[PDB]
Amino acid sequence: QDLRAFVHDSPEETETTQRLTKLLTNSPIPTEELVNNLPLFLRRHQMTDLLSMDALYRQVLDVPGVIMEFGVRFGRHLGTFAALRGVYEPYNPLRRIVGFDTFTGFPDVNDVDRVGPTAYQGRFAVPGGYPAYLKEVLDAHECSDFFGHVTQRSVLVEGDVRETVPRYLAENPQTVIALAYFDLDLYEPTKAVLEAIRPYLTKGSIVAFDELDNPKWPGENIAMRKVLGLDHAPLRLLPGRPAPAYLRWGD
Amino acid sequence: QDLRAFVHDSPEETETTQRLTKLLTNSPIPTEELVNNLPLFLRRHQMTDLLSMDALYRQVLDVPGVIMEFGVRFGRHLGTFAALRGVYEPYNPLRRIVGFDTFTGFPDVNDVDRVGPTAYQGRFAVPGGYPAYLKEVLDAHECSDFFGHVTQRSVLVEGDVRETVPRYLAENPQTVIALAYFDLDLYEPTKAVLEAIRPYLTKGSIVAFDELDNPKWPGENIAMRKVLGLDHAPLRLLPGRPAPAYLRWGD
Amino acid sequence: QDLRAFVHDSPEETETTQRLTKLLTNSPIPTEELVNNLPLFLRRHQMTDLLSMDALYRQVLDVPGVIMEFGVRFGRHLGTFAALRGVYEPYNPLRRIVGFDTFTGFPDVNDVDRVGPTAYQGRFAVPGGYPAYLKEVLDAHECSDFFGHVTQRSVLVEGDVRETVPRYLAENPQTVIALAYFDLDLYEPTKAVLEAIRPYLTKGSIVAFDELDNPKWPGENIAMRKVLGLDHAPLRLLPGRPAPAYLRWGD
Amino acid sequence: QDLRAFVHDSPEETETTQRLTKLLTNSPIPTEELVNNLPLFLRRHQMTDLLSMDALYRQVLDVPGVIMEFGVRFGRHLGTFAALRGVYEPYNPLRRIVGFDTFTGFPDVNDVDRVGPTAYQGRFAVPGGYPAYLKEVLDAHECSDFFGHVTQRSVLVEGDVRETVPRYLAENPQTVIALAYFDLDLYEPTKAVLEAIRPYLTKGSIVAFDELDNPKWPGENIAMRKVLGLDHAPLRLLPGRPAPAYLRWGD
Amino acid sequence: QDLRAFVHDSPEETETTQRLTKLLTNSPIPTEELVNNLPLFLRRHQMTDLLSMDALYRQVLDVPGVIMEFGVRFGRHLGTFAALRGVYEPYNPLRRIVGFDTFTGFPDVNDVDRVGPTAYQGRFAVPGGYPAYLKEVLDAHECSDFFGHVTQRSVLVEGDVRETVPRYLAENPQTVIALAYFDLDLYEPTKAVLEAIRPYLTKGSIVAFDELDNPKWPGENIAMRKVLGLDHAPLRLLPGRPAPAYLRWGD
Amino acid sequence: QDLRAFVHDSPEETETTQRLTKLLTNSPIPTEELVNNLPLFLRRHQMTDLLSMDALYRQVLDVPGVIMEFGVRFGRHLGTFAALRGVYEPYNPLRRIVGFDTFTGFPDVNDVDRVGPTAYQGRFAVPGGYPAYLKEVLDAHECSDFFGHVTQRSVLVEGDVRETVPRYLAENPQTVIALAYFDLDLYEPTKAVLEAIRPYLTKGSIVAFDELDNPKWPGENIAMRKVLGLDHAPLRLLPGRPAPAYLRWGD
Amino acid sequence: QDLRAFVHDSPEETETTQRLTKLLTNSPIPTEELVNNLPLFLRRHQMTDLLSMDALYRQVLDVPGVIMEFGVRFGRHLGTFAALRGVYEPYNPLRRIVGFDTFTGFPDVNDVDRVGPTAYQGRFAVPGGYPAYLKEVLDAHECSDFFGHVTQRSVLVEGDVRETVPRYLAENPQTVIALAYFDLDLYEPTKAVLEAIRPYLTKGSIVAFDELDNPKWPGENIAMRKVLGLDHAPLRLLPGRPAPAYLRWGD
Numbered sequence A, B, C, D, E, F, G: 001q002d003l004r005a006f007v008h009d010s011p012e013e014t015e016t017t018q019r020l021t022k023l024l025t026n027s028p029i030p031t032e033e034l035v036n037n038l039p040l041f042l043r044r045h046q047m048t049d050l051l052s053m054d055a056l057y058r059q060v061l062d063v064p065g066v067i068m069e070f071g072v073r074f075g076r077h078l079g080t081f082a083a084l085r086g087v088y089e090p091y092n093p094l095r096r097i098v099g100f101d102t103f104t105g106f107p108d109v110n111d112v113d114r115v116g117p118t119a120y121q122g123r124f125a126v127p128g129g130y131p132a133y134l135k136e137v138l139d140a141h142e143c144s145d146f147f148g149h150v151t152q153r154s155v156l157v158e159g160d161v162r163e164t165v166p167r168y169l170a171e172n173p174q175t176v177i178a179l180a181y182f183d184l185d186l187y188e189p190t191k192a193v194l195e196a197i198r199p200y201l202t203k204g205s206i207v208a209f210d211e212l213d214n215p216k217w218p219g220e221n222i223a224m225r226k227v228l229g230l231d232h233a234p235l236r237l238l239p240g241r242p243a244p245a246y247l248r249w250g251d
């Protein structure tokens, strides 16, 4: 296998990324103004991810239910949703944001996922004790929400989605899922979650995938073709971006 | 169970409510002008409910049939509908408003309902002889409707909806249901009412829930997933408001 | 001489008002729940007013600036605006609501105003100390706004608008007027104020009149025709309602 | 029972109707000008019926086939369609108007039809010889049609629709039905006619009902639910009018 | 001088009119059912007139102000408007209907008016005391209006419009004109009224002419060209009908 | 059976037709300019047919495939199509126009076709040698088409469609049918051709009938009801015209 | 000067025209059926001219007034208009069709018209006595109009437009011009008529030119630029066709 056939950063993207890291970490901005100037360090690729999440969220503002992410890593998307929920929904204490991850990286891989060299147990592990920090970040956002006095509006569920997702659902019979964001990369957990969330979607719910047509991670495609079929609903892109691919339930 | 995980009033929301109550009861406004200045005392949260009811009503203006509320309490919504019916349909004597309730609170609760501390029989009980008072309120509105001379345009049906709803439908084979507003909280009566009203709905009829995705009251969701499925039709919010969740039958 | 040629309440309308008044003041609803059930006592005519204000507010949600009402009486419209502002603009602390009145009724009437038997000095006077009460009412609402910590978001200006409006404007050079609601009834103050607010309107600003084509109060029409002409912009009704008459500046 | 729960004329509506009747029959208008000033005597309620037939007619101008009314009485609607056909379709000699009736009133009633005190044999009977008069009225209209030389564009079919409708259809195999207006009030004949006309409807054909949700006449509702179901197509009102309820075949 | 170049009735139109006149005045329909069956006698030409007036009325439903007709004769249009005001605006007691006429025919004529042989003083005169009968007819309609207790909602002003229209305006300074219907036929009075009404129109008000391009009555055209110019606004027809021609002020 | 109940020419339509014919054959127009002034001799009824053909054709400009007429006679529609194909599709040599006919009138007739007097064998026959002449007419048109070097873009298929249509289809397996125009009048061949063309239609293809609801030729209706059902797709008129009736395949 | 740089018939276009002429004059079609089969002989170029006239007429269906063609020749467009008026406006006897021509060719050419070899006096002359034949053709159409009893609905005005157009307008003060079709080719008359018709156009009136940007006839352009300017209104093509160029008055 030629590693260059997989999507990877150009020398230029790496340099931009490194330079911005340096300028953030060695900034002459007074410390208490840094969080007021973050777009200085938010480059095209990452800006694009933010704008995509906003696009997805704007499509479920008239749909009841919660937002769910499978595959959280450091929580980039969860931070986005928490901010976006403040922007769009000050008066919606029921828009719960729920993140699922082992927080210890890939639990185990299936043969179908072994395409490139990063398909191994432990990949994307974040540091020990990470969830408590991420929760602390989320709580910092919620502190100034109109419904900040209501708790469990952000929830991190730690462990294998194959177990945690059905358990979460059993414990929350009130669930409707407005937006389901799949970023697991792996075939087995994707398939299992797709199956479990099905009774809690309504027509109009968004199902989104981070890696559906990526050669390095065919698992999500394989899972989709198995549980539903690629033409079960219309899979769409936000024009100009390879990801996410997303569908509107019932369409 | 942490009670703060359930939606509850902020201290400032309580304060607003309490101050407005006091300013309503101790007012330099002549008593004869109070009903000409009610918005002085109608805070955001309740104004929102009024706007929501108006929004749902406007969606059934071209749909034949009647308006039904399952779960009335003091009758806030019934009064709204009566006023709105005047605004929109002076020439429609067949737009009957029917409110079902025990008027003695929750008759009995199912296991699935006991998530929180208010899940007891008698909860939301209104005083003795309340239905007659509400009838007087409704009559007072209708007294100046264009079709005020026609009776039973507002009907209060006392008792368990498990029997009163099939009984009302039986006594009224002419029924078409334009708007079904569900506020029963409990699994059992919701399921029963859903099943009973189904043959009286047309494509375009609105079925609306007050608590579809509230952790405190999962019985409406459980009932929905049992009788119909969350994706039977597109469930929707009016953007910015946790509730009602509503669907357009047949969509 | 024929007073029936002026709009007045039918016997039934009078009946509705008195009855609902009686039912409000002698309600079995626990006193602390009354402000949660105000629609019971909100009749068609008043509901219509509320819906109209909402319709006007919605037309300026993408227009910067403040809301001004000229002629407040007990503050029916100010309460409405204050609640709607919570509904629509939790994050807009610049949307100031400004009500102008003598609060002692008509200060001095012109001959053109003297069409009916109620065009007298001091007509619509409210009790001494009223502005402080109304301010308490508005403070009560603002208590639980997202930006409740910011003061002077509701301002009552007491005096003859012929002097107080130009003074307010001179004191607030940041002013842009999104919504100007005219409810003074009288020719001279309407003329004066129409002239003064003009440099503070943008294309898209709404100017509304409560009695533009009412035989009993021709002053607003007379003022309009003299200052701008009736075809300066398109004057509109919300269909089904004799009032308000409103125009979008620049259309 | 209490008859006042049934839709009935107000004292004022009765007054309007009697006054207009007297003003028509005892008028200073020259006799040859009466038919040029009919709207003087056409009150809101009957104007509404006319505007409704017009709205229904306009929806089938792009649909091939004939117009049928079941339940003609004096022929109010037949006169309307004959005029409207002139307005919109000078060049369509195939737009046949067919009216069915006993012209001797209700032939017999089912038990479900006996809610009110008018549900007996002979009800709504028209005098002997009436059909021949009604044909005179129709012929009079057609005399000035562009296709006035083509006979049988208006047809009165006398008898019980249970027999006459299928008979008419068998004798007319070219039939397409663009508009079917149901005004029989009773259950069994509505049911029979519904089942009969089905093979002659196209998608877009209008099926309309005068009494679908009237408590006094539940037969049409019962028939509809028995034959098709209330959610077979979207049943609709023209906004602000209790009747007719109509559907677009295939929607 | 060919009279067949003027629009006149065909033999068939004449026959239809005569027959319907006979069938109306010699009807076997019970006297109390006549005004429930008037469309039996309303032929194409007149039905067309009715639908045209309805079309114009619908275009001013969101325009404040009154309806004026200049040239009333027997009042066909006034009756139409009275019914239509009921259909569309039960809650607008300010929609005054004002009809201007000598009620004794053409007061005098101009030479430009003398194209055909019906341009003589007294043409279209109605019997003595006619305004009292027409007022009785209008009062009959209003008797059952929601705002029936408000008087002078219909006004017949007798005299030459050249003086009566400016006098009406001077006495009613609250006037906005939503719909102005010119049916005077003659140049001079049309000219004078067009000039008088102008300060009372808003953008969106409708001005309609019954005979704008009629070779028999060039008066309205000459007047229009003199006062405004034919391209002052877009003059329009309702497709398929020679009259009325109308414009939306300001367009 | 009254023959006046079938559509037939009025005396005036006959007169117009006979006059135009005489004016054509006895024209002072120079012979070589006649084909530049044909609209002089094209009356309303025939102009309408042309506009209808153009309307149907415009609906299939984005649909692949050929144009078929069943029932050609002298070739009126084939000539229209040839010219229209020039107007809209100079660059489409695959838009073949195929006309089927015996060219000897009806080959037989069924009992259901025998409603009128002209339902006999050989009705609508054209002279011996006629197809060769018609072919000469079409070749003249194609001579100046952009793709006039490609042959068989117009094809006359002589014989009974019961045999020739399936034979044509077997010989042309590339066939898609964009527009199928039925003008056979008769039950049996309509039925046969309807079944045969089905596999060659796409969603969007237009099926059109010239006689669908004509009492004199109920065969096409009988065929439709038997093969597809009148509600298989929406049958449509071009407003104002009794015919064609046409449907969009798959709607 | 190269005459090839002017638009002219290709050999194939010439061949088509001559063949069709031959086939029309030696046709086996029974003489009485010729006028039922004209599209056989209507080639693309001529079909195109008909569809454009139809497109133009369709755009003035809601505009009052008459249709004028300046430059009639053999009357092709007038025939088209007569028939289209039948298709679209059976009920509009005021839609006068007025054609102006010398009927003896170009009266005299300006120097700016002498670009090609056909720019000479007498060019396009029609036989002596032609107008009576054309009128007889027009009368033939009108014979079967709904308003056929109204005369002068077609007018041929013989003479020089510089004199006849102003005379016609002076004699017809009721004139509104819905559609003005310029086909004079020459500068002087085009300028004169443009100036003359202006006071009779309304906003929406269509002004169309047959030779606006034709090198061989620059006279219409020169006149447009002198009288109004090319950017007075938006000049438009029906896409695909070099002519007509048309504008919508007031756009």
Ligand SMILES: Nc1ncnc2c1ncn2[C@@H]1O[C@H](CSCC[C@H](N)C(=O)O)[C@@H](O)[C@H]1O
Pocket (backbone or CB within 6 Å): A070, A071, A072, A073, A074, A075, A076, A077, A100, A101, A102, A103, A104, A105, A106, A107, A123, A124, A125, A159, A160, A161, A162, A183, A184, A185, A186, A189
């Ligand atoms: N079976 C499973 N259960 C829980 N998490 C899983 C899982 N399989 C994969 N994951 C998680 O999916 C994540 C993929 S990385 C996703 C986050 C993304 N990089 C962002 O910044 O937005 C990893 O953290 C991995 O631990």
Ligand SMILES: Nc1ncnc2c1ncn2[C@@H]1O[C@H](CSCC[C@H](N)C(=O)O)[C@@H](O)[C@H]1O
Pocket (backbone or CB within 6 Å): B070, B071, B072, B073, B074, B075, B076, B077, B100, B101, B102, B103, B104, B105, B106, B107, B123, B124, B125, B159, B160, B161, B162, B183, B184, B185, B186, B189
């Ligand atoms: N089985 C049952 N039959 C009748 N009423 C029931 C019921 N189960 C619950 N309810 C009622 O549901 C109500 C919920 S409180 C909802 C009312 C609220 N004020 C509003 O505006 O709609 C209670 O009053 C309770 O008595």
Ligand SMILES: Nc1ncnc2c1ncn2[C@@H]1O[C@H](CSCC[C@H](N)C(=O)O)[C@@H](O)[C@H]1O
Pocket (backbone or CB within 6 Å): C070, C071, C072, C073, C074, C075, C076, C077, C100, C101, C102, C103, C104, C105, C106, C107, C123, C124, C125, C159, C160, C161, C162, C183, C184, C185, C186, C189
């Ligand atoms: N010149 C002036 N200066 C200040 N207030 C004036 C004024 N002229 C009239 N007003 C006020 O205009 C008011 C009219 S009543 C307004 C009613 C109120 N907006 C409601 O919704 O109920 C009176 O209070 C009167 O005092």
Ligand SMILES: Nc1ncnc2c1ncn2[C@@H]1O[C@H](CSCC[C@H](N)C(=O)O)[C@@H](O)[C@H]1O
Pocket (backbone or CB within 6 Å): D070, D071, D072, D073, D074, D075, D076, D077, D100, D101, D102, D103, D104, D105, D106, D107, D123, D124, D125, D159, D160, D161, D162, D183, D184, D185, D186, D189
């Ligand atoms: N079985 C049946 N067969 C024929 N006519 C019937 C019938 N049952 C009821 N009807 C007729 O239905 C009619 C209802 S009254 C219809 C009123 C009329 N359409 C209008 O617009 O005014 C009666 O005339 C009655 O004779």
Ligand SMILES: Nc1ncnc2c1ncn2[C@@H]1O[C@H](CSCC[C@H](N)C(=O)O)[C@@H](O)[C@H]1O
Pocket (backbone or CB within 6 Å): E070, E071, E072, E073, E074, E075, E076, E077, E100, E101, E102, E103, E104, E105, E106, E107, E123, E124, E125, E159, E160, E161, E162, E183, E184, E185, E186, E189
């Ligand atoms: N100067 C004037 N003052 C008042 N009326 C005038 C007038 N000049 C003409 N008229 C009136 O214009 C009328 C024209 S006939 C109007 C008919 C009526 N609009 C209908 O719908 O049937 C006549 O009644 C005539 O009296």
Ligand SMILES: Nc1ncnc2c1ncn2[C@@H]1O[C@H](CSCC[C@H](N)C(=O)O)[C@@H](O)[C@H]1O
Pocket (backbone or CB within 6 Å): F070, F071, F072, F073, F074, F075, F076, F077, F100, F101, F102, F103, F104, F105, F106, F107, F123, F124, F125, F159, F160, F161, F162, F183, F184, F185, F186, F189
């Ligand atoms: N079974 C059959 N097979 C082939 N042609 C048939 C047929 N039945 C009827 N036809 C033909 O259908 C034609 C009907 S006349 C249709 C032609 C019309 N002028 C037009 O513009 O299209 C006749 O020519 C007849 O010969």
Ligand SMILES: Nc1ncnc2c1ncn2[C@@H]1O[C@H](CSCC[C@H](N)C(=O)O)[C@@H](O)[C@H]1O
Pocket (backbone or CB within 6 Å): G070, G071, G072, G073, G074, G075, G076, G077, G100, G101, G102, G103, G104, G105, G106, G107, G123, G124, G125, G159, G160, G161, G162, G183, G184, G185, G186, G189
């Ligand atoms: N000054 C003038 N007065 C009257 N007619 C004129 C004219 N100048 C040119 N014409 C006429 O304009 C015509 C141009 S040919 C017109 C062709 C025609 N419109 C068609 O559709 O076939 C000629 O007949 C010519 O006589």
